[PDB]
Every structure is written in C-alpha cells, then in structure tokens.
Ligand binder design. Structure first.
Ligand SMILES: [Zn+2]
Lengths: 186, 86, 46, 95, 73, 81, 81, 77
RNA sequence: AUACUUACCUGGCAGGGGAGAUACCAUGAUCACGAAGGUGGUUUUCCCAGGGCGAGGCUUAUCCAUUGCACUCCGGAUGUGCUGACCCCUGCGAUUUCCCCAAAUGUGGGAAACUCGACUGCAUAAUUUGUGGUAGUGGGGGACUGCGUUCGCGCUUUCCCCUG
C-alpha cells in the first residue's frame, strides 16, 4: 500500500518502559582502552624530545658560549657569515670582507672530528662602524657562486640566544616542507 | 568494477521496495544504479484475505523499462540470457 | 626581449630589461656580457 | 563546507565537542547504549567505532521488540553493523 | 544545477498533486532549480468538495509530486 | 571513513536485515562506496515468504537496515584504518 | 552523463509510461527530457492505485519522485547498445 | 519575476500569520508569524498554533522552529 | 602570419597504491664541531591493492601403443573449467622536449610539462538517486458480539491454534 494510506496498527513507540541498563558500580573494564600504532609513536616522540631537552640543559651547564677560546674581540665588532661555499679560500674571504673595512682577525670554523669546513666564519673588523656598514650590504652577497647571508653575531650580544642544536637560530631551509622558501635570505 | 560489468545482458530479477519483482534483461547501469530491463514482467505478492489460498500472482508485461536505483532493492539471476543459437 | 647576460663573477645567466640598472641579480656584480649570437656564422677554412 | 580545503578537520572537532561526542565518549568508557530504530525495535549494546554517517560498530547487542495481547520478543547478536538513516533515538546509560 | 524547463507552464492555470493525497489549483508565476513553485489564486482543494481560496502561496518542491496544466499550456 | 572497513569484509559470511524485514545470509564478494554489496551463494528470506537460495545478489545500500558479522572479527585491528 | 539518461534523451518524443512513488501510472507522449529525470508528457492516461482513471492534456513530473519508466522496445537498437 | 525567497522575505517583513502544512501529514497544520528563514527552508515563528482538522483545537506553542523538509504548503492568514 | 585594447561565445578544485622500520643521500640547518623531526630519494617488513611469467597440481572426453607379475603415487599428446609458489612495476590509455644505450629513422631507459578521462576526497547525510516518511507493524482454521444486507459479504468486539 501507499505510505500515506498505510494503516499503522502499531506505530513507533517510545523507550520509557525499556530502561534496563546495568548499575553504576558495574564499571567498564579499565584496561579495554588502547590502540596500536597510534600511542607508542607519541610516546617515542615525547621520550626523544625530553631526552634532547635534558641533554640541552647538560650542555648549557657544561659549555659556556661567552667563555670560548676561539671567540675573540669585541662582540659588537665581530660579524657572522654563513652559507659560504666550502671552496672559499681564506684570501677570497679576505678580499670579499675587507672591502667594508680592515679585518683585524678572521676565523673559519672547522668540524672538530671530521675537519671539514663548517661553512660559516666570524670576521672581526678594526672599527665597529665598518661592521655596521657591512651589516646591510654583505647580506645576500655571492662568494664562489653560492649566496651567503650576513648578520651581526648574536651569540654573545642578544640575551637568550642559542644555535640550532639548542633550539634557537634563524632560517628555515630545513623547516616544514613547503613552508619556508629557499629564495628568501636572511 | 567488474562485479557489474560481468553481469551485463543477463536476465535479472529486480526486487522493489514495495515487494514487487521486475524480471527482465539487465542491459546497462550507472553509478546511481538506474537499470534498463528489456521484455520485463512485473510480479506482486497479494495476501489472501478470503481463506488459506495459494499466494495470488498478477503478472504484467512492460517491455523496455528503466528502474531507478533509489527504488531498486536487490537483483538476482533468474536464468542465463536468451540464447541466440538454435 | 629576454636579453640574457652572463655575469663576470659568477658566470650566471640572467635576464636584463632596458632601463634596468645593470647588476647581476645573483651576486650584485656590475659587469655582464652579451651571449653569443644565434645568427648563422660561417668561416671558409683559409 | 565552510572549510573547502582538503586538510579540514571539521569532522574531528565535531565528534570531539559536538552532539556526536556521545558516541566518542561511549567507545572511550566502553559504556552500553540503547538505540531506537525504524524497525520499532530497540537494540541495547556497546559501541566500538563510528563516523559522521552515524554508523556504529556494535558488539554484545540485544535486540528487543513487541508484537500485537502485546507479546515481547528478544534475541542476542554478538557482532553487528547498524546504519544511521534508520536510527531514531540513542540513549546512553543514565547512571 | 540545471533548472527545469517550466517556461511553458509560466502564467498558466495548473493543478498540482502533493505527497499526502492533497491537491491544489492555481496559476504559476515562477519556479526554481529545486522545483520551488510560486502559484497565485491557489485553492486548497481538500478531500471534500468544499473549496477555499487564499490566493498567493508557496509550495516546496520536495513535497510537489505532479503539476498538470488545465489550460493545455 | 568506515565503508572501507565494510569493503574489507570480503570472503566472509554475514546476515543482513533490510528495511522491509527481509533477511539475507551469505558471503560477501564486493562493496562500493554507496554501500551496495554483492553476495554469492546467498539465501534470502522475504517477509512472510519462504527462503530461497540465490547464486548471486547485488543489493543497494539505501534499503539496508543492518548487518550481523561473525563473532571472531578483529575489530581493534580492523578499525586502525 | 549516465547511460539510462542518454537512453531517455533519445527516448524523447515517443510514447512512454511512468510510474511514481505514489503509485499512479501515466502513459502518454513524451515532450521534454532532462538529466535530472524530470519528464514532461502530453495527452496521457492516468491509472490510480485504486484503479480509477482520468484525462489530462499537459503534465510535468519531477524525476526523483518516479519509480520507473516504460519506453518503446525498439530503443534497444540504439547504436551505443 | 517573483521568487519564493523574495516572497518569504515579503511575508517576513509584513509579519503576516503564515500557515504551514506537514510532510505526509494532512490533519495537522501550524500557524505563526515568521521571524527568519535559512536556505534549508527552516522557519521560525514567534507565537505558533497547532491546529488539527478533526479536533479543531489550537495548541499554543510560542517561539518555535519548524524544519523545512516537513513543510508542504504555505498559506497567508 | 605575430603582439596589443574592447565585445561576444565555451569551463568544478587537490592529487598519483597505503601503514611500519630506514645505520645511509639531499635539504651541504644562522652563531665558534652538531640538532632531532620534517620534506624528496634509496634501503627494509606487510593488509596483498591490481597485473605479467604458468613451472607444478585438480576434474573429464579424444587419439596411439600395451596380454603387461605388481605390491614407494606416475605411459605420450589435444580439448573444457580451475588453482597456482618463486621472481618483477608500485599503476595509467595518448601527446610534447632534453640526454643517453643501441641490432643507430625502429626497438628502450633517466627527467618533468600542463591538456581528456567520471580513479578518489570534499560542495555529497540539508529538496533531484551515493544516509529514508517505501518501517516489517500480518494472514488463515475453530468458538465468540453488534449495524446494514443481495445471506456471498463491508465495518466492528473477544479466547485458543498453524504460519512469518
Ligand atoms: Zn653574477
């Protein structure tokens, strides 16, 4: 028959006379709440993160950035250049950074164990003004075909500054995919 | 989606929501399940209100029919397709 | 229209437009060179 | 939807804080639930999973209904799959 | 979202059938892709022979079942 | 989603009830996104009718009321996706 | 588009029958057909669920509210089939 | 060309008592002054009255809402 | 034949099996040797998600030969319908450009480019199919009420039984 002319001899009733659930104290099994390949991963991410944070506190307590034999000269005078090509000779870096002013000292950092060039150096100019003059112009320079950025080294100037391994730094060349453009420079 | 392609041209009986049975040659379908039946016949089960009598069947020839998937419940093979060989 | 020039320092190709100040976009180096023409050139081997 | 991007988690926040959270909390605490369906029958059982379509995965269910004097009829189904459109009402354990 | 080709029935006296065995009769003035029709000079046409004219009304396409043109378009 | 889980129950035997009171017991062979399921070597039982064995049956998802799955189904492992 | 929809578009202009969810069956000439199954007919013969009939001249029907359609058997000879 | 949306907006501004029919139900109807409406056709009334043909009793409801799917036919006053 | 400005006519977005393990490559990480992770590869286990190889094995007829002395299955070939270990691509029908192997116009490999498919997700549970007003809610045999009656029946009120 049709839905409108159908004689409902027993239409839908309620549920008021059909409440026969189990008592409250009869709680559900506590151990029956878990999932695989969803929580163990978060657990491993939390442990590796806390383990690193603790290694960070130990490194900060053991090593002192300011009290570094390699670091020398006035902090406001020293400069920091990174993304430098590994083939850049010391003389090439001199000819490129003496233009802004005479260089009292130049320091090329090297791997402690591997000895390979790190790719960044600290340049100490004779005058603080030569450094400030280089701050704006040096950033974006091209040495040996690879672009390089330049900013005043904040390791001993900015309060609360630390490198990548300690959670700080700048630049996102290795941040979330498709979130930091490689064309933009510091 | 060979589950439906393998069954093309077979003599299928479609079960309607109202209880009817449309038996015809399943020709083609679509995502909505709208079927095309050739030489279809409609059967319906009527309850006996007079006495304990055999179920009353009222056959009805239709020919070419287009059934809406929303109105289609299920479908099964009544028999192989009409053999064209002598 | 493109006008590719080769930078002296980094030897990099780069487009330059008319009225555009001459400076390699890559290294800020102000010396560039026109690329070798495409015109057909022949030399009798005399 | 308001968030046409493919990374939208609207269904997520919906199940977490919306009306459909009754089923999330039901599967979390493993609590029973009684459902009134279009079959005029009530199904009492636990839930293990669901989605936006209100299709729940039940276990240890007990179907119950009445016909006509009115006589009651009940049976048991240890594992089944309920549809959403046919659902009328849901009621968690009020305890 | 192609709308229905109801331009023929525009400004014509129709008699529509609804879901619950109900019928109406009025002159059509506009439609929509969802079959939302707007008919004027509409009569209720209840189950009994009694007639009740109210005039301008609106009908939902989800409940509109059939529309016949008494003026043969 | 969950229909993927429904599509993962191929080769297993279940008992589905329809919105018209019809019962159907058989093995699943294929499912679509619209919940339409194909059961082979199935037995159907319409309301107030006699059971009948059908070698195949393609059912739509709209007219389905509910399913009855085996007792040994690994829900915790099968709901991971 | 769908194959049944195409079969309907080519079925345009011929005598066809249409049954709706309310049970009424209308048989007459088809005037216009659309992708959404909306069908317009002319000079039709209606049969109600009780059996009574009536006479109409120009009728339009919504597609979603149609149970099924009967078309000329000769349409089976279409080139796509 | 008047559309249903514009007509509903006119009835709304006029605050006229619009009556509404139910889907699949002929005996009961509802009447009230519309306050607003959405694309889903859901309608809100300030003072609703449920009237039945058989009983002819008008049950007062007050500020209420009605689903668009349940609507079947609108009527003025 | 090209570009420029305007009017008119056509059109739905994202992609390229998925979950673990990766000591190793790229990202040569912005602070005095360092990240992890992530992203794009390579390596490595699976639900096997589709295919290719059809060796081996199962069912039954046709043809040839055998009179045979075995007790550890088994004569050779053809046809019908099946299964199938191991080993390969992570999946495209078509088109365009660069480089290379080459039996050098063909046969192939490493790269992308944006073009049609109805492959998937969201507009898809908000009126037109992919998330319900098509609920399934009964039928029949005996006793057991009433109204009308053509005594066949329409409506209506009870108990016991078979049937779903
Ligand atoms: Zn340069």
């Amino acid at each position: 028959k049709l839905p409108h002319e159908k004689h409902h001899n027993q239409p839908y009733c309620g549920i008021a006379p059909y409440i026969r659930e189990f008592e409250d104290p009869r709680d559900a099994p506590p151990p029956t709440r878990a999932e695989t390949r969803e929580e163990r991963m978060e657990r491993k991410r939390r442990e590796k993160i806390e383990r690193r944070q603790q290694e960070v506190e130990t490194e900060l307590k053991m090593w002192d950035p300011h009290n570094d034999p390699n670091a020398q000269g006035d902090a406001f005078k020293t400069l920091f250049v990174a993304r430098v090509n590994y083939d850049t000779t010391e003389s090439k870096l001199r000819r490129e950074f003496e233009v802004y002013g005479p260089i009292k000292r130049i320091h090329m950092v090297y791997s402690k164990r591997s000895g390979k060039p790190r790719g960044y150096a600290f340049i100490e100019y004779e005058h603080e003004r030569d450094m400030h003059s280089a701050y704006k112009h040096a950033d974006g320079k091209k040495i040996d075909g690879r672009r390089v950025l330049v900013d005043v080294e904040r390791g001993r100037t900015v309060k609360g500054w630390r490198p990548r391994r300690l959670g700080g730094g700048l630049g996102g060349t290795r941040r979330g995919g498709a979130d930091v453009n490689i064309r933009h420079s510091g | 989606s060979s589950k439906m392609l393998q069954h093309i041209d077979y003599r299928m009986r479609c079960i309607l929501q109202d209880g009817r049975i449309f038996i015809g040659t399943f020709k083609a379908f679509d995502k909505h399940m709208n079927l095309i039946l050739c030489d279809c016949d409609e059967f319906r089960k009527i309850k006996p209100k007079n006495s304990k009598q055999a179920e009353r069947e009222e056959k009805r020839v239709l020919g070419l029919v287009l059934l809406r998937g929303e109105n289609l419940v299920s479908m099964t093979v009544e028999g192989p397709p009409p053999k064209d060989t002598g | 229209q493109p006008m590719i020039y080769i930078c002296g320092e980094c030897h990099t190709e780069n487009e330059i437009k008319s009225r555009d100040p001459i400076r390699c976009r890559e290294c800020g180096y102000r010396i560039m060179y026109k690329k070798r023409t495409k015109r057909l050139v022949v030399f009798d081997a005399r | 939807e308001m968030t046409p991007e493919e990374l939208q988690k609207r269904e997520e926040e919906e199940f977490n804080t919306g009306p459909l959270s009754v089923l999330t909390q039901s599967v979390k605490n493993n609590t029973q639930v009684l459902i009134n369906c279009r079959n005029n029958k009530k199904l009492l059982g636990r839930v293990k999973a669901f989605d936006r379509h209100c299709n729940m995965v039940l276990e240890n269910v007990k179907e119950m209904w009445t016909e006509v004097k009115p006589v009651n009829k009940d049976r048991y189904i240890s594992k089944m799959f309920l549809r959403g459109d046919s659902v009328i009402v849901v009621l968690r354990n009020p305890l | 979202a192609h709308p229905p080709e109801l331009k023929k029935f525009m400004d014509k006296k129709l008699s529509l059938k609804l879901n619950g065995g109900r019928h109406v009769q009025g002159i059509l003035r506009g439609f929509d892709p969802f079959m939302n029709l707007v008919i004027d000079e509409c009569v209720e046409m209840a189950t009994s022979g009694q007639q009740n004219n109210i005039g301008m009304v609106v009908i939902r396409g989800n409940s509109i079942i059939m529309l016949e043109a008494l003026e043969r378009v | 989603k969950l229909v993927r889980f429904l599509m993962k129950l191929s080769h297993e035997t279940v008992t589905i009830e329809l919105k018209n009171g019809t019962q159907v017991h058989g093995t699943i062979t294929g499912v679509d996104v619209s919940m339409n399921t194909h059961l082979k070597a199935v037995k159907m039982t319409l309301k107030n009718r006699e059971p009948v064995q059908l070698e195949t049956l393609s059912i739509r998802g709209n007219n389905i009321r509910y399913f009855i799955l085996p007792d040994s189904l690994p829900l915790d492992t099968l709901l991971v996706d | 588009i769908g194959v049944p929809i195409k079969v309907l578009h080519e079925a345009e202009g011929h005598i066809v029958t249409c049954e709706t969810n309310t049970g009424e069956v209308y048989r007459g000439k088809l005037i216009e057909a659309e992708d959404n199954m909306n069908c317009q007919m002319s000079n039709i013969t209606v049969t109600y669920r009780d059996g009574r009939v009536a006479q109409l001249e120009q009728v339009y029907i919504r597609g979603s509210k149609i149970r099924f359609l009967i078309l000329p058997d000769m349409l089976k000879n279409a080139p796509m089939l | 060309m008047v559309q249903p949306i514009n007509l509903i907006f006119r009835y709304l501004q006029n605050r006229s008592r619009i009556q509404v029919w139910l889907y699949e139900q002929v005996n009961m109807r509802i009447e009230g002054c519309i306050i607003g409406f959405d694309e889903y056709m859901n309608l809100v009334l300030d003072d609703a009255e449920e009237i039945h043909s058989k009983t002819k009793s008008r049950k007062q409801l007050g500020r209420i809402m009605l689903k668009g799917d349940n609507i079947t036919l609108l009527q003025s006053v």
